RNA sequence: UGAGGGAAAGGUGAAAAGAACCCCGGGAGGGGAGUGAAAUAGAGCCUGAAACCGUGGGCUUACAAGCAGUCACGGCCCCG
RNA sequence: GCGAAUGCCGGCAUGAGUAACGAUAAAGAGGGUGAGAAUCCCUCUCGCCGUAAGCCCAAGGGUUCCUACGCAAUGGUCGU
RNA sequence: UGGCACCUCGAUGUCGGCUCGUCGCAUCCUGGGGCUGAAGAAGGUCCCAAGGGUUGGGCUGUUCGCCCAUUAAAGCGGCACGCGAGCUGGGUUCAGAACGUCGUGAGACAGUUCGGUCUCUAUCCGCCACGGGCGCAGGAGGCUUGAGGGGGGCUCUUCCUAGUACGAGAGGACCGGAAGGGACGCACCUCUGGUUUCCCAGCUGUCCCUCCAGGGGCAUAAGCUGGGUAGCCAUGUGCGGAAGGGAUAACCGCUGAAAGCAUCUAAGCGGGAAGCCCGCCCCAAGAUGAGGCCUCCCACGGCAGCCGGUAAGGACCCGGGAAGACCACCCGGUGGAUGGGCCGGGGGUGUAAGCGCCGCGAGGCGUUGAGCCGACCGGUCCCAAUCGUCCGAGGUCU
């Protein structure tokens, strides 16, 4: 049973899941638009628009917060100082999530892109 | 949640310290005593020449336990060991005190005696 | 259909606002109605605060006293209509939400680890200056 | 209910394999 | 014999007496008469009823045609109570009064493909003691050669749950009409949403 | 556990019964709006990288 | 380890005349073109059985009980 | 003169698209190359070893070394 | 326990236990009876009865048995002395060792003793689950009848009646009525109580970022510790066994001859079991004997037939789901609250960081119930369910 249990497993245990949705993030904050397998993608969503969220928040602990995650100075501040502005007055949905339509050949698995809103 | 192998303390002065349950009798197949219910038990530690000695089978009521025994008010309560005071075959106190506190259900269970004699009932 | 709602319509007729917000780690008096066949009368327990579980109308506490050498520990629906009136006894500055660590505690330990708390002490005295 | 205690008539098994053939 | 479509809302518990009352809330009114049963025309006698509304974008045309005749609005949900026939053209809470008794029937949860312990309560295999991969295993299905087969309805693991369950004899504790609840005492199948059906009871 | 094994050779009938199964369902595909191209409904068009009406990606 | 044990594996065509060149393909392979009496003799090559695997057609089959056939009748399809 | 010798040799079936794909130290993305890329190169990130899973001798192997050009087959997938 | 030596020595694994049971009835209990050396209560003995029930522990490999504490009762047997492709492996078949005994000896024993390899993959039938196909003479969307099945079927204590009937007394009812249990079943998660792999906090070593402050990895597949929401859960909670109708068993009878009396029977009619039929709960029209009701579509083109476009509908695809291995089921798909984010509440945790103050310091106090914050109850189109494709009747004959 699984009833009513938010979150995939990723065939990751809990300490590599969390790494693995930390480094997309590290991917995507910095590229703007990555590829992934879909569920993968699917799950980089939350996990980056709360960080993004933060950002827009702005304040100090919102930084060492959001630092938390995402390690490196230089970024977070181009998180904080390019890409927060952005979504002064959105209200989440920060990023999307798109199916494209190609399967990976070595496995014929579904990939997605993940990016940034404008 | 008594059941037979639990050791109970005995909480009176019958010279009994220390006793070990060896049946819930509570139906033909009781799995386990709670409140009120009497047990037939072994004594498996004793003082020097009390009423009841070592190795004594006998029967007592249960009346603390350390699992918690819930209330039709919602409420529950819950003790530090689990308790039973030696009683004789018409369930009076074969002891003459009874120390510490015991659960008001003890009345309800007509032991009525055994609460009296009892400084504290909760 | 809100659901949440609806089960909170359904509490609402019984939850109660008369009684006084406390902690764990503060000292309470529980005044409780019993029956005792045949007279129900009102019995004070009193002791620490060792858990508040809290579930809306379901939250409920509990509360630890050594009674005649005998630890015991009895749990309180916060809306139970049985409840006379809960007196605060003495406020007590915990560390954390559930104190089931003073179960093992010399008497003069539980004292060292629950200090009293002053500041919500003064607090309290802060009102009771009624006008 | 057999009172004449029943023999095994078989040894418990087992020992060795025949590897290989090859 | 009376009877109405509902949903589970929830559980708490209220106090009568001095006496905590482990309730479950159903929503049931109210629930529109869509069609009748009738022994001349159908064979038997019963009310198919309507409950919850539905969006009419959403209601094909042969349903909105059978909805249509009856001169009702379009419903989630149609279930028939047998046997009851009311007086009125909609069946609401009030045909039950605190202190009845009745029984409710729901889906229970579903529990998936479960093993022999946790749908039949076997007793699985020791933990130790030599126990070889088989902890939670039936045991033997079987005898030799005679009969040289096995039962049917032996019972083995497979899915569990997500069925038809009705539970009994439960108090009508309260009824509100202001807002379609009642309060059954006690526990009904379902998730907190399932849909329910609450009957006047059996047992006397 | 005792080495289960076939007791009989499965029929060249009885083999191809099995696979009664085993036939694949054609991928399921649409005409990309834009440049009239047939696609996997719900992807980007990988054709002309349209998806909803805008251009997403270069191709 | 060693003494020692100890296989499988023959055949284009008369003649290489062993398929220039084009076409699809990364290539493999193939389609044309060419050679030849013959190329399902094209080199993975005489002949090319059988088991085994396919494709296309005819008859048949989803209320039936079976060492699978045999005898009878009927239906359909083929050759007159 | 074969149908049986758990016969001999060989070929091809069944089991079955089934078990498995060899340590639970672990991966992610971007860029490149290429007909073709989860699997090759490069960069960033993350994990694992560190009396080792790093380094040096010796046996034993015998060109496996270094470059260029390749991907039929070997590589438990893929493969540039 | 034996006799026999018939399949099986190109193998039918054998004691006991565990697990799962199923059946017999020569019934242990519980229901119903006759007789009694049956006053009562209790009990003897026999008859009817297999629906349900039939406990925990000491000894020993043991089955068996003895014993302790209970109990309504602690039934006996069959199923390869049921069940090793289900587990065990204590015991009895091998190799080692020893004792007693026997043998000059090697060795031996229906003696004793310690030790001693139990085999990932299910073809078929059978079983538990779930689909696919076709069929149910037009195609569709709903809602149902229930043939036939399956499930269930236990029992105690107390009190009232009544210290009455009965009995010197001790003891002590029938009938009828009330309450409270044991075990078991189905559900559930309000409470109690678990877990809750990252929801919060503390803590040590170490490497790091960025020196401090603050943080990160690793110490497990949570480093360790204290807690812990939903969910799944029992020790927790609700509810179940029936009632009731009908036909019967043994048994008791009414009326009544053959047989002027008698007779429960030959005619006929009563009463009578936990058992039988129904009733309860669940499955169920492949019930090919393929049922019924309500609604929707309809006479479309060319030659009980085929082809093509539609009709009502349907599937595909997508977002999902206390549904689920896949499948299936259910909800949603911008005419939208489906999941994701954001917002509010809940809930955990238990007063973040920063800064000001006090202390030499470790720290402490205040900002501050702060900061963080999974799933729960909701709001909100910010993100994504874009756009679409394909199936699909034209109704056989008396
Ligand atoms: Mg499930
Ligand atoms: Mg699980
Ligand atoms: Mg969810
Ligand atoms: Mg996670
Ligand atoms: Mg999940
Ligand atoms: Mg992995
Ligand atoms: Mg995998
Ligand atoms: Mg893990
Ligand atoms: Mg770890
Ligand atoms: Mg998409
Ligand atoms: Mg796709
Ligand atoms: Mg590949
Ligand atoms: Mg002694
Ligand atoms: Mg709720
Ligand atoms: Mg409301
Ligand atoms: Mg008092
Ligand atoms: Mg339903
Ligand atoms: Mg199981
Ligand atoms: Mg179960
Ligand atoms: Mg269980
Ligand atoms: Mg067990
Ligand atoms: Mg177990
Ligand atoms: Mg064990
Ligand atoms: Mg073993
Ligand atoms: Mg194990
Ligand atoms: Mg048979
Ligand atoms: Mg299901
Ligand atoms: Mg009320
Ligand atoms: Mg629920
Ligand atoms: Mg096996
Ligand atoms: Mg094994
Ligand atoms: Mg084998
Ligand atoms: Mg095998
Ligand atoms: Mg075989
Ligand atoms: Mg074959
Ligand atoms: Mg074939
Ligand atoms: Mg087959
Ligand atoms: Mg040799
Ligand atoms: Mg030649
Ligand atoms: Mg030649
Ligand atoms: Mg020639
Ligand atoms: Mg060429
Ligand atoms: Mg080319
Ligand atoms: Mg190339
Ligand atoms: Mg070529
Ligand atoms: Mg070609
Ligand atoms: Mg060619
Ligand atoms: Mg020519
Ligand atoms: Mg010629
Ligand atoms: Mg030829
Ligand atoms: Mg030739
Ligand atoms: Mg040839
Ligand atoms: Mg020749
Ligand atoms: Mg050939
Ligand atoms: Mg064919
Ligand atoms: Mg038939
Ligand atoms: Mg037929
Ligand atoms: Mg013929
Ligand atoms: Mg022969
Ligand atoms: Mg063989
Ligand atoms: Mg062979
Ligand atoms: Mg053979
Ligand atoms: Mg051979
Ligand atoms: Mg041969
Ligand atoms: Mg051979
Ligand atoms: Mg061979
Ligand atoms: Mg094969
Ligand atoms: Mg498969
Ligand atoms: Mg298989
Ligand atoms: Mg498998
Ligand atoms: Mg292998
Ligand atoms: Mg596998
Ligand atoms: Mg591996
Ligand atoms: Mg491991
Ligand atoms: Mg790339
Ligand atoms: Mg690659
Ligand atoms: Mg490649
Ligand atoms: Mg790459
Ligand atoms: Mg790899
Ligand atoms: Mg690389
Ligand atoms: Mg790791
Ligand atoms: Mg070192
Ligand atoms: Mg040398
Ligand atoms: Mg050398
Ligand atoms: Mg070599
Ligand atoms: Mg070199
Ligand atoms: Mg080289
Ligand atoms: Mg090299
Ligand atoms: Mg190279
Ligand atoms: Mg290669
Ligand atoms: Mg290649
Ligand atoms: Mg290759
Ligand atoms: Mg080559
Ligand atoms: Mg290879
Ligand atoms: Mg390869
Ligand atoms: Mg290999
Ligand atoms: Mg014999
Ligand atoms: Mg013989
Ligand atoms: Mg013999
Ligand atoms: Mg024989
Ligand atoms: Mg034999
Ligand atoms: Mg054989
Ligand atoms: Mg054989
Ligand atoms: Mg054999
Ligand atoms: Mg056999
Ligand atoms: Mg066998
Ligand atoms: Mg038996
Ligand atoms: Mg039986
Ligand atoms: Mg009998
Ligand atoms: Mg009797
Ligand atoms: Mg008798
Ligand atoms: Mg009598
Ligand atoms: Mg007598
Ligand atoms: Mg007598
Ligand atoms: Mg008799
Ligand atoms: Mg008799
Ligand atoms: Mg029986
Ligand atoms: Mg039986
Ligand atoms: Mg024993
Ligand atoms: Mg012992
Ligand atoms: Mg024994
Ligand atoms: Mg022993
Ligand atoms: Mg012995
Ligand atoms: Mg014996
Ligand atoms: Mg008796
Ligand atoms: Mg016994
Ligand atoms: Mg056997
Ligand atoms: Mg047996
Ligand atoms: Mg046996
Ligand atoms: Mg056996
Ligand atoms: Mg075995
Ligand atoms: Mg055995
Ligand atoms: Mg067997
Ligand atoms: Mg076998
Ligand atoms: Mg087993
Ligand atoms: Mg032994
Ligand atoms: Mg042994
Ligand atoms: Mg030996
Ligand atoms: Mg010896
Ligand atoms: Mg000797
Ligand atoms: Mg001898
Ligand atoms: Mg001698
Ligand atoms: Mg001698
Ligand atoms: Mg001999
Ligand atoms: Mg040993
Ligand atoms: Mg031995
Ligand atoms: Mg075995
Ligand atoms: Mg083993
Ligand atoms: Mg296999
Ligand atoms: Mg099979
Ligand atoms: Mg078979
Ligand atoms: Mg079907
Ligand atoms: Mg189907
Ligand atoms: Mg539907
Ligand atoms: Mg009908
Ligand atoms: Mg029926
Ligand atoms: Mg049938
Ligand atoms: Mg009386
Ligand atoms: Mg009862
Ligand atoms: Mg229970
Ligand atoms: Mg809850
Ligand atoms: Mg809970
Ligand atoms: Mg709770
Ligand atoms: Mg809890
Ligand atoms: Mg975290
Ligand atoms: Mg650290
Ligand atoms: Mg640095
Ligand atoms: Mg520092
Ligand atoms: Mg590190
Ligand atoms: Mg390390
Ligand atoms: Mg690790
Ligand atoms: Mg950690
Ligand atoms: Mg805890
Ligand atoms: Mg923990
Ligand atoms: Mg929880
Ligand atoms: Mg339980
Ligand atoms: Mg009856
Ligand atoms: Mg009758
Ligand atoms: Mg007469
Ligand atoms: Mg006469
Ligand atoms: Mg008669
Ligand atoms: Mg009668
Ligand atoms: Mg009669
Ligand atoms: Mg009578
Ligand atoms: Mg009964
Ligand atoms: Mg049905
Ligand atoms: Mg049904
Ligand atoms: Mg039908
Ligand atoms: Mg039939
Ligand atoms: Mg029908
Ligand atoms: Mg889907
Ligand atoms: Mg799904
Ligand atoms: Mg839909
Ligand atoms: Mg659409
Ligand atoms: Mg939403
Ligand atoms: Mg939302
Ligand atoms: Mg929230
Ligand atoms: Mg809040
Ligand atoms: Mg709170
Ligand atoms: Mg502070
Ligand atoms: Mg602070
Ligand atoms: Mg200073
Ligand atoms: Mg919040
Ligand atoms: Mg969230
Ligand atoms: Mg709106
Ligand atoms: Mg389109
Ligand atoms: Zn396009």
Known sequence: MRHLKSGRKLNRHSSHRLALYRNQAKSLLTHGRITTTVPKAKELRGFVDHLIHLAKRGDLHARRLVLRDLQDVKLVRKLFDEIAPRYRDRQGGYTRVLKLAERRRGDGAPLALVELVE | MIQPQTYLEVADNTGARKIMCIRVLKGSNAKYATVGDVIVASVKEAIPRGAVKEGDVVKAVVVRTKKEIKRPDGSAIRFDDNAAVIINNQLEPRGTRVFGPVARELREKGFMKIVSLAPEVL | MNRGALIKLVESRYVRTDLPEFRPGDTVRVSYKVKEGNRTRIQDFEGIVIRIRRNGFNTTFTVRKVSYGVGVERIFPLHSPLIQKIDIVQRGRARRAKLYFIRNLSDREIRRKLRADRKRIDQDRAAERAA | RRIRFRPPYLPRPGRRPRFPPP | ???????????????????????????????????????????????????????????????????????????????????????????????????????????????????????????????????????????????RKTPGRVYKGKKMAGHYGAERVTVMNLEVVDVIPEENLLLVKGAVPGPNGGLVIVRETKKA | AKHPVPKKKTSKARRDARRSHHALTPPTLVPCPECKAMKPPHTVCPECGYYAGRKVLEV
């Open chain 5, 1 to 143: 014999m009376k009877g109405i479509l509902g949903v589970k809302v929830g559980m708490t518990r209220i106090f009568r007496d001095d006496r905590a009352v482990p309730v479950t809330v159903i929503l049931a009114g109210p629930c529109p008469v869509v069609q009748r049963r009738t022994p001349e025309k159908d064979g038997y006698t019963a009310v198919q009823l309507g409950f919850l509304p539905q969006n009419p974008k959403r209601v094909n045309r042969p349903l909105k045609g059978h909805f249509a005749k009856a001169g009702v609005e379009p419903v989630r949900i149609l279930r028939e109570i047998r046997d009851f026939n009311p007086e009125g053209d909609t069946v609401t809470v009030e045909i039950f009064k605190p202190g009845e008794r009745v029984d409710v029937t729901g889906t229970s949860k579903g529990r998936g493909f479960a093993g022999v312990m946790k749908r039949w309560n076997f007793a699985g295999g020791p933990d130790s003691h030599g126990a070889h991969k088989i902890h939670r295993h039936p045991g033997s299905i079987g005898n």
